[PDB]
């Protein structure tokens, strides 16, 4: 399967669509399709490659930063983060933690 991915950046008022097949992990995908996003870690492991869930699901178990309260309300790591449906995620959402 090959599921769509739209990238939003609310501050920037920016929307990208990129296709995502179900083996490869969002960041990877978004920089194959031409679209930099942040990342430091690449594993799972720290903020940088945070996004929020507006619609649709992934898959995220490589990750390991988040709590579950915050996997509930909807974070996400895009750099070991697989979509499991389309989804709709808004990036650059590091700073929502804190
Ligand atoms: S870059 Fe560290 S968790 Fe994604």
Known sequence: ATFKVTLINEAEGTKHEIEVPDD???????????????????????????????????????????????????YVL?????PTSDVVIQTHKEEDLY
């Open 24 to 74: 490869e992990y969002i960041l990877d995908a978004a920089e194959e399709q031409g679209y930099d996003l942040p990342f430091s870690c690449r594993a799972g492991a720290c903020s940088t490659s945070a996004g929020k869930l507006v619609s649709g699901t992934v898959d995220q178990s490589d990750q390991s930063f988040l709590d579950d309260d915050q996997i509930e309300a909807g």
């Open 78 to 82: 895009t750099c070991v983060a697989y």
